[PDB]
Design a protein around this nucleic acid. Structure first.
Length: 159
DNA sequence: GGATCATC
DNA sequence: GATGATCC
């Protein structure tokens, strides 16, 4: 029930498709997850209007874009939607992929979908502390291997 | 709107 | 071959 929902979450995170720079993975997705991991910790709303998130995640990409991350939260949240971790509804029709640039801006600017982390994962990280460490340590090892994470970890309530 | 690369 | 993204 709860433990199965836990290892479900990790399985999806371990099997994430992320782009990789010359020296490591692009941090678009972990910046997104840790932003939602922190919000789930403080019990904050689950879903948010895209402009409110586009700013929030985009702000963190501006501050901690260690691999030239530009403030484009639409790339990770589409990969995470395909990964089963993100809920997108409000839009009409079908959700695009994260291959391109213009269409990613146009789709989000036109539909303006309300998005958040998946309902069972958000509530799980709220109540379960065992899962917050297993999701942070997993993301920190695979994505931030060699980098200073504590500035980002601070700016999301995850110190 | 596109060429292009790396990863899946 | 489809998907996460750089770059024009």
């Amino acid at each position: 029930t709860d433990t199965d929902r836990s290892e479900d979450f990790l399985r999806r995170v371990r099997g994430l498709k992320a782009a990789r720079t010359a020296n490591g993975p692009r941090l678009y997705q972990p910046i997104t997850l840790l932003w939602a991991v922190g919000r789930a910790r403080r019990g904050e709303a689950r879903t948010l209007a895209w402009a409110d998130t586009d700013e929030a995640i985009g702000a963190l990409l501006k501050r901690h874009g260690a691999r030239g991350e530009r403030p484009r939260p639409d790339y990770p949240v589409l990969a995470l939607h395909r990964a089963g971790l993100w809920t997108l509804e409000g839009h009409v029709g079908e959700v695009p992929t994260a291959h391109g640039d213009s269409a990613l801006r146009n789709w989000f600017a036109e539909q303006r979908p309300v998005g958040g982390l998946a309902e069972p994962f958000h509530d799980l990280l709220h109540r379960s502390g065992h899962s917050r460490v297993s999701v942070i340590e997993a993301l920190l090892t695979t994505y931030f291997a060699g980098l200073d994470p504590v500035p980002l970890l601070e700016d999301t309530g995850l110190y």
